[PDB]
C-alpha cells in the first residue's frame, strides 16, 4: 500500500559541535577580530511546540569562547615588546612622600641598569612599582623571573569588552530558550531559532559578574548540582547593583628606549597624594540584593535554617579577591566587606572595598607568560553593573547551621555560561523518508 518516499528539506535536527563565526574602534581587539556585521537581526523564528532539551553545563559554545578569547588575547599581544631585559636586580627604597598610611610600603621606588639601543651602553633608570609585582632578594627582582620572560602589552591594543554576537555557519542553527526562569537544564517549552545570538560582553572577573544581562523577572540561582558542594552556584540578579571603582593618584608615564625600536613604559612620579584604590557599593542596594538571593536560596535548604555569607578564604589573589580590569588596569579588591551577614530567617550608606592593583598579570592561570600592563596616566573612574555572583557551599555535616557561603573564582567558563545557557546549536538534517501511497 505504501512505498518509501524520500523527502528532502525536512525540518529536523541533531545536537551539534561546531564553530561559530563571531560578529560585531580601531584598536579594539574584538572590533578588529570579527568584522562580520550584525545589527539587523529580527531573524528570530518562534517555534511552536518543539520543547527542546538544554543543558548549560555541557554547552560547547562556552568552551568555544574560552578557547577563542584566549587565542585572540595572546595573538593580539604576542607582537609587542618582550621585556626580557627588565629582569635584573633592582635597587629599591619605598615611596615615602605625599602618602597616606594605607599606602605605606605599597609602592617601591626602584632604580636599575637598563640597556640602551646600543649594545655597549647602559642607562640608569627608575620606575615606581607596586609591591605585588616585586620580590625581595634574600635588593629586589621582578616576581615573574621565577618562571617567565614577560612582555609588555601594547598601548595601542584595546581590550574594552565591546559585546560580540555569535552566529552559526550554514547547515547549523541556534536554538534559543525563552522559558522565563529557565534554570539551565531540561525540556525548555518555548524556543525560537536564531542565526545569531545577542551580544555578550567578554568581561573578565572573579566573584562578581559585571555588566552581563539581568534576569527578566526574579533572581535566579542555578547550579549543575545544588547538593554538591564541589559545584559552583551562579546567581543572576534581576536588578543591577551599582559599583563605583577608582584609582586615585594622578600618574604619569615614562617612555624608555631599551632597544632599537623597543620602548618600555615605566611609572613616573605621582602627582598629588598617594591613596589606596577602592570600590563603592551601594549599601542598601547590596542589602536588598542579597536579601532576594537568600530568599531564593532557601528553596534548597531546611526549614528556618540559618544562612550566612562569609569571607572568601583561599590561597591567592584570583581566588580570594575580586579581580577585574577597568581603565586598562588590573584591580584586586577585598570583598570581605560584602560577604558578611546572617539572615536569621526572621528579620524586619556606602560599603568601601579597599583595593590593590598589579601590572604583571598571568591572565589565565598558566605558569609562565604574563603581560605587564603599562601604566595609565591621570586617574581612573569606573562605574559598573554587578549583574551576578559565583558562590560555593561548605558541604559540612548538617546540624542545622547552613553554609556560610563564599564568593569565589574559577576559570572563565563560568562567567560565560551565565549568558550562554540560553543557547544550543544544532545540525540541520534535511534528508529523510516516510511511507507514501505512490510509485514511479
Amino acid at each position, epitope marked *: 500500500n505504501l512505498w518509501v518516499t524520500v523527502y528532502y528539506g525536512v525540518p529536523v535536527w541533531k545536537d551539534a559541535e561546531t564553530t561559530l563565526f563571531c560578529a560585531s574602534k580601531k584598536h579594539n581587539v574584538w572590533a578588529t577580530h570579527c568584522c562580520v556585521p550584525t545589527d539587523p537581526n529580527p531573524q528570530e523564528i518562534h517555534l511552536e511546540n518543539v520543547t527542546e532539551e538544554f543543558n548549560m553545563w555541557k554547552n560547547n559554545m562556552v568552551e568555544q569562547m574560552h578557547t577563542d578569547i584566549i587565542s585572540l588575547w595572546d595573538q593580539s599581544l604576542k607582537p609587542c615588546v618582550k621585556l626580557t631585559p627588565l629582569c635584573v636586580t633592582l635597587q629599591c627604597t619605598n615611596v615615602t612622600n605625599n602618602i597616606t598610611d594605607d599606602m605605606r610600603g605599597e609602592l617601591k621606588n626602584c632604580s636599575f641598569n637598563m640597556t640602551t639601543e646600543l649594545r655597549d651602553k647602559k642607562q640608569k633608570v627608575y620606575s615606581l612599582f607596586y609591591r605585588l609585582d616585586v620580590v625581595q632578594i634574600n635588593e629586589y627582582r621582578l616576581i615573574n623571573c621565577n618562571t617567565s620572560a614577560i612582555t609588555q602589552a601594547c598601548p595601542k591594543v584595546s581590550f574594552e569588552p565591546i559585546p560580540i554576537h555569535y552566529c552559526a555557519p550554514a547547515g547549523f542553527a541556534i536554538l534559543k530558550c525563552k522559558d522565563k526562569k529557565f534554570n539551565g537544564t531540561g525540556p525548555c517549552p518555548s524556543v525560537s531559532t536564531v542565526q545569531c545570538t545577542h551580544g555578550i560582553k567578554p568581561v573578565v572577573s572573579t566573584q562578581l559578574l559585571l555588566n552581563g544581562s*539581568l*534576569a527578566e523577572e*526574579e533572581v535566579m540561582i542555578r547550579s549543575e548540582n545544588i547538593t554538591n558542594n564541589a559545584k559552583n552556584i551562579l546567581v543572576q*540578579f534581576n*536588578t543591577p547593583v551599582q559599583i563605583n571603582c577608582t584609582r586615585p593618584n594622578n600618574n604619569t608615564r615614562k617612555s624608555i628606549r631599551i632597544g632599537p625600536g623597543q620602548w618600555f613604559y615605566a611609572t613616573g612620579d605621582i602627582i598629588g597624594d598617594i591613596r589606596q584604590a577602592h570600590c563603592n557599593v551601594s549599601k542598601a542596594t547590596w542589602n536588598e540584593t542579597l536579601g532576594k538571593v537568600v*530568599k531564593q536560596l532557601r528553596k534548597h535548604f531546611g526549614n528556618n535554617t540559618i544562612i550566612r555569607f562569609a569571607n572568601s578564604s583561599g590561597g591567592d589573589l584570583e581566588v580570594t579577591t575580586h579581580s577585574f580590569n577597568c581603565g586598562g588596569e588590573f584591580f584586586y579588591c577585598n570583598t570581605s566587606g560584602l560577604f558578611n551577614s546572617t539572615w536569621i530567617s526572621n528579620t524586619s550608606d556606602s560599603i568601601t572595598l579597599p583595593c590593590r592593583i598589579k601590572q604583571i598579570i598571568n591572565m589565565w592561570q598558566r605558569i609562565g607568560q604574563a603581560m605587564y600592563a603599562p601604566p595609565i596616566q591621570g586617574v581612573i573612574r569606573c562605574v559598573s553593573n554587578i549583574t551576578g555572583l559565583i558562590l560555593t557551599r561548605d558541604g559540612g555535616s548538617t546540624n542545622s547551621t547552613t553554609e556560610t557561603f563564599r564568593p569565589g573564582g574559577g576559570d572563565m567558563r563560568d562567567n560565560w555560561r551565565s549568558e550562554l545557557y540560553k543557547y544550543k546549536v544544532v545540525k540541520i538534517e534535511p534528508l529523510g523518508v516516510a511511507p507514501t501511497r505512490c510509485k514511479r
Partner: nanobody
Amino acid sequence: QVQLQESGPAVVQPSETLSLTCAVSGGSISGGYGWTWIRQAPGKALEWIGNIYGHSGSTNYKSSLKRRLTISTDTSKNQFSLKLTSVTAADTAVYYCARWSTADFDYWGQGVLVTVSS
C-alpha cells in the same frame, strides 16, 4: 516598610471597563518585584489575576482573561494598575493588589470591593 494602596470605582456597569490603581509607597515601583492583582469573589476563595514586573513588564495573565485584561505601570506616580474590559456579574470581587517576591506575597493592600451593576 512597603505599603500598597488600591483605589478606583466601587461600581462598574456591565460591559464597561474596570480600572484599579495600586499606589506604592515605602519602596519603588521600578524594583525587581511582581506587582500582582488578585481578587476574592464574595463567598469564594482568592483567585490570581495576573502580574507585571517593576523593572521589565514581562507580564503573566490568567489566560481566560487575556483578551479583556491589561496590566501596566506608571513610574511617574510610583503606581501600577489593573484594566479589565467588558466586565460582567462574575467579575464582582474584592480586588487586592500585592507584591510578589520569590515565593510569597510580602505586601498587600486593603482592597477595593467592586460590584458589577447597572
